[PDB]
UniProtKB/Swiss-Prot annotation:
<feature type="region of interest" description="TEN">
    <location>
        <begin position="1"/>
        <end position="164"/>
    </location>
</feature>
<protein>
    <recommendedName>
        <fullName>Telomerase reverse transcriptase</fullName>
    </recommendedName>
</protein>
<comment type="function">
    <text>Catalytic component of telomerase, an essential ribonucleoprotein enzyme that copies new telomeric repeats onto chromosome ends by repetitively synthesizing the short telomere-repeat sequence 5'-TTGGGG-3' using an RNA template component TER. TERT is a reverse transcriptase that adds simple sequence repeats to chromosome ends by copying a template sequence within the RNA component of the enzyme.</text>
</comment>
<comment type="subunit">
    <text>Component of the telomerase holoenzyme complex, composed of the catalytic core (the catalytic subunit TERT, the telomerase RNA template component TER and TAP65/p65), which is associated with two heterotrimeric subcomplexes: (i) the replication protein A (RPA)-related subcomplex, composed of TEB1, RPA2/TEB2 and RPA3/TEB3 and (ii) the CST-like subcomplex, composed of TAP75/p75, TAP45/p45 and TAP19/p19. TEB1 and the CST-like subcomplex are tethered to the catalytic core by TAP50/p50.</text>
</comment>
<comment type="similarity">
    <text>Belongs to the reverse transcriptase family. Telomerase subfamily.</text>
</comment>
Amino acid sequence: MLTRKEDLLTVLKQISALKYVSNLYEFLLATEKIVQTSELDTQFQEFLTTTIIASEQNLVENYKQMTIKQVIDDSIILLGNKQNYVQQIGTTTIGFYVEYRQTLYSSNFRNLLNIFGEEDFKYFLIDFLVFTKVEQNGYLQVAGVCLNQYFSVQVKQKKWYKNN
């Protein structure tokens, strides 16, 4: 469920498998998808700086330089048989069809789709764990391999009464 920023960050820095962690704004800058002077609404700009993303490797060079619903469906289809991605939750995939994300449909992500371009956006949701600020110091993962999949590997524990 919802997580506090400092908790998300401490968990993320502890996971050695995730070598890359940044806020979205800086990633878009490094990949040159946007530049310092790009015209950005304050809401969207606040969305870029508060959104946190993580990947196993540094994919900046890889990302250098249609409805949102459709792009997301295609993205999910690209997952193949892989499992445990946030976007797959409560989803069933059969061939090119997906049946059954509220945040991913927002204007923020639609603007993100237009800046990334169709192809890169599709892979973005796969290569990155994406955490968005839902409320005051309240983060939610909206895409990528479920964080729990990594914590579990980093900190392997058989049994416990509870560990949120």
